[PDB]
Amino acid sequence: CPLMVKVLDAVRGSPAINVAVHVFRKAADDTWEPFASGKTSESGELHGLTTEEEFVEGIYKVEIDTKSYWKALGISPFHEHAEVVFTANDSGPRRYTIAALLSPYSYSTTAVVTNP
Amino acid sequence: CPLMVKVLDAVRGSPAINVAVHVFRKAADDTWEPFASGKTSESGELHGLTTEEEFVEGIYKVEIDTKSYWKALGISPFHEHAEVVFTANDSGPRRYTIAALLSPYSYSTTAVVTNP
Amino acid sequence: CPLMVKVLDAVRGSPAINVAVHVFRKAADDTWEPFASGKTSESGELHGLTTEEEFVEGIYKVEIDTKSYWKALGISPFHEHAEVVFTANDSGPRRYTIAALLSPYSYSTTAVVTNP
Amino acid sequence: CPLMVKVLDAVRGSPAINVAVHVFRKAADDTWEPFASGKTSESGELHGLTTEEEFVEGIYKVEIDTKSYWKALGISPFHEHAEVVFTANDSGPRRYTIAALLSPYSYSTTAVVTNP
Ligand SMILES: COc1cc(C(=O)c2cc(C)cc(C)c2)cc([N+](=O)O)c1O
Ligand SMILES: COc1cc(C(=O)c2cc(C)cc(C)c2)cc([N+](=O)O)c1O
Numbered sequence: 001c002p003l004m005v006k007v008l009d010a011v012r013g014s015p016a017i018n019v020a021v022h023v024f025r026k027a028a029d030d031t032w033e034p035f036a037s038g039k040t041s042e043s044g045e046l047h048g049l050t051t052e053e054e055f056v057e058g059i060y061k062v063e064i065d066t067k068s069y070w071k072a073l074g075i076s077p078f079h080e081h082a083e084v085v086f087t088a089n090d091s092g093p094r095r096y097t098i099a100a101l102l103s104p105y106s107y108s109t110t111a112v113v114t115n116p
Numbered sequence: 117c118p119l120m121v122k123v124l125d126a127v128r129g130s131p132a133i134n135v136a137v138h139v140f141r142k143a144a145d146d147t148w149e150p151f152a153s154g155k156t157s158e159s160g161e162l163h164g165l166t167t168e169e170e171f172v173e174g175i176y177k178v179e180i181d182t183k184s185y186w187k188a189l190g191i192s193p194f195h196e197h198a199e200v201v202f203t204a205n206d207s208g209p210r211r212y213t214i215a216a217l218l219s220p221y222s223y224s225t226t227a228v229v230t231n232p
Numbered sequence: 233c234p235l236m237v238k239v240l241d242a243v244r245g246s247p248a249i250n251v252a253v254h255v256f257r258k259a260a261d262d263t264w265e266p267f268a269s270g271k272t273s274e275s276g277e278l279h280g281l282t283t284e285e286e287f288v289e290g291i292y293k294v295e296i297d298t299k300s301y302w303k304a305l306g307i308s309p310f311h312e313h314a315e316v317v318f319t320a321n322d323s324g325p326r327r328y329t330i331a332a333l334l335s336p337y338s339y340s341t342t343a344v345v346t347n348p
Numbered sequence: 349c350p351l352m353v354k355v356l357d358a359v360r361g362s363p364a365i366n367v368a369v370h371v372f373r374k375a376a377d378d379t380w381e382p383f384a385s386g387k388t389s390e391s392g393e394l395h396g397l398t399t400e401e402e403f404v405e406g407i408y409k410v411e412i413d414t415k416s417y418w419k420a421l422g423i424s425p426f427h428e429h430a431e432v433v434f435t436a437n438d439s440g441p442r443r444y445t446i447a448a449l450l451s452p453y454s455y456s457t458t459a460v461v462t463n464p
Contacts, residue, residue: 008215011229011243013310013337043436044228059428077155078245078459080407080433086426099124101217103335105245108224110217111129111426112160113453127359129426129453175312194343194361196291198315202310219451221361222342227310229337245461333458340456342449345361 002055003036003096005046005062011075012101019069023049035060048114061085062098070104077106082084086111118171119152119212121162121178126219127191131160135185139165142175151176177201178214186220194221202227234287235268235320237278237294238331239301247276248334251301258291267292291322294330302336309336316341317320350403351436353394353410354447355417364450367417371397374407383408405437410446418452425452432450432457438460 003023007016019040024032036049062084070077084098097112119139123132135156140148152165178200186193200214213228235255239248253273256264268281294316302309316330329344351371355364367388371381384397410432418425432446445460 008226008228010226010335010338013229015228015230024382074188078434078461080435083431083433085428085431101224101338103242103338103458105461106242106333106335106456108217108340108454108456110124110126110451110454112127112131113426114131139388194318194345196319199315199317201310201312201315209437217454219342219358219454221345222340222358222449222451223341224338224456226335226338229310240458240460242458245459247460333456339447342358343361344356344357344363 001050001095002052003049003060005040005049005064006097006099007040007044007046007064008099008101009069010101010106012073015042016040016069016102017042017044018072020043020065021049022063022065024061024063031098032061037098051083054092055088057088057090059085059087064100064102066102066107069102070109071075075104079107082107082109084109117164117166117211118168119165119176119214121156121165121180122144122213122215123156123160123162123180124215124217125160125185126217126222128189131158132156132185132216132218133158133160134188135160136181137162137165138179138181140177140179142177146178171204173204173206174204175201180216180218182218182223185218191220195223198223200225233279233282234248234284234325234327235281235292236327236329237270237272237281237296238329239276239278239296240331240333241276242333242335242338247274248272248301249276250304251275251276251278252297253278253281254295254297256293256295264293272304287321287325290319291317292320293317296332298334298337298339301334307336311337311339313324314323314339314341316343318343319335349398349399350396350400350441350443351408352443353386353397353412353443354445355388355390355392355394355412356447356449357392358449358454363390363391364388364417364448365392366420367392367394369394369397369414370411370412372409372411374409380409400441403437403441404445406435407433409433412448412455414448414450414455417450423452427453427455430455430457431456432459434459 139152257267373383
């Protein structure tokens with residue numbers, strides 16, 4: 001609800017299904033602490049990562065396991081993973097969607113931040 | 117239903133709302149004939165462009181009026197518009213989503229083609 | 233020199249070699265008139281399309297023949313071409329680099345505009 | 349020479365000048381060790397990060413300091429940085445160009461890998 005991840009595949013023209021996604025929150029000692037994770041669904045979406053109560057301001061990292069995704073499809077990939085790092089800021093009501101568009105040697109990411 | 121367009125804004129991190137979208141189908145004489153049009157909604161999506169009966173195989177052009185979108189936001193843009201040209205092919209049941217991610221001097225587009 | 237095109241391949245992580253590019257300019261009667269054409273080199277770059285004298289103000293369309301590129305590599309891609317449409321030189325001469333990053337179901341384009 | 353980074357700005361249509369870039373290499377104990385750093389020139393390019401001798405096999409992370417770039421232009425961007433993580437030189441030496449295209453709420457990255 002506060003945070004959704006969506007992953008698309010630029011080679012096949014499809015959602016990127018069954019991609020592992022790990023979210024971390026930066027701790028006080030600057031290390032990355034596990035926060036939430038899951039696998040994208042048949043629509044390429046990963047819902048239910050967190051709740052409003054749990055998702056406080058801070059620095060988050062979303063790691064998308066692109067390498068395993070490509071290897072499951074039999075395609076040779078460049079990256080280890082894709083990492084999206086951002087600050088969550090409570091500037092009134094907000095929902096964050098982190099979207100990624102994957103190719104073997106490239107990826108694109110955007111944030112769609114809306115007031116629900 | 118068979119064809120949806122979604123437009124996102126990379127500068128503001130938001131759906132691209134109220135963007136005009138024109139779809140054309142290539143005619144026998146190679147000209148582009150108007151086929152469907154609309155404006156993206158508050159979610160950046162444009163539904164209801166066509167129906168299964170109307171959307172036959174052929175070459176289609178989706179023109180996204182990016183210049184007017186940026187000017188309504190007070191941002192100076194490079195492109196006249198963004199044009200996505202593709203062939204619709206009846207390889208079993210298919211839904212097409214044409215997605216575009218806009219910046220003033222760049223855009224990205226992908227096709228998400230799924231079997232419903 | 234005033235207009236260069238660069239094309240990269242996001243599947244292979246390489247320049248996109250031997251990509252045909254056609255440039256058109258909108259004529260007074262609103263049709264697209266041929267302006268220049270060429271193909272990308274081993275570096276993915278296409279230089280020498282035009283000259284400072286010939287590259288006057290106007291609305292230009294750079295058509296990158298992405299389908300032909302993919303088909304020659306044995307791939308069936310989604311798009312027919314990538315088209316980049318922009319007004320050039322409207323505040324005096326500029327140098328334009330039009331870049332494209334290709335995948336079978338997606339492309340991205342950017343413009344770099346410099347004042348010489 | 350074996351590792352170059354190029355950064356472009358999708359808002360202005362320009363090279364992204366004075367962008368700080370930090371490269372790390374995974375050490376035997378799985379931590380990220382500093383490897384090289386620099387900043388992009390007026391062309392948006394960063395050359396001379398490393399040498400053929402120093403750029404051995406390994407897992408490398410190229411951190412592009414996009415937030416610092418935007419903040420110096422007076423813009424509040426979404427991401428903290430753009431990180432590009434890849435195994436290099438695993439089948440012998442290659443030349444790598446890591447490119448990034450920046451917007452306030454989005455970025456794209458690609459790799460061009462060539463065999464010298
Ligand atoms: C929020 O919802 C959506 C977002 C996006 C996107 O941000 C995106 C992101 C990138 C990097 C490229 C494109 C062309 C688009 C695509 C979607 N889509 O269904 O293709 C979508 O639904
Ligand atoms: C000028 O020279 C180059 C330009 C560019 C680019 O404009 C570009 C364009 C797009 C759509 C995405 C990215 C990440 C970058 C990439 C290059 N490259 O090596 O990936 C390159 O050499």
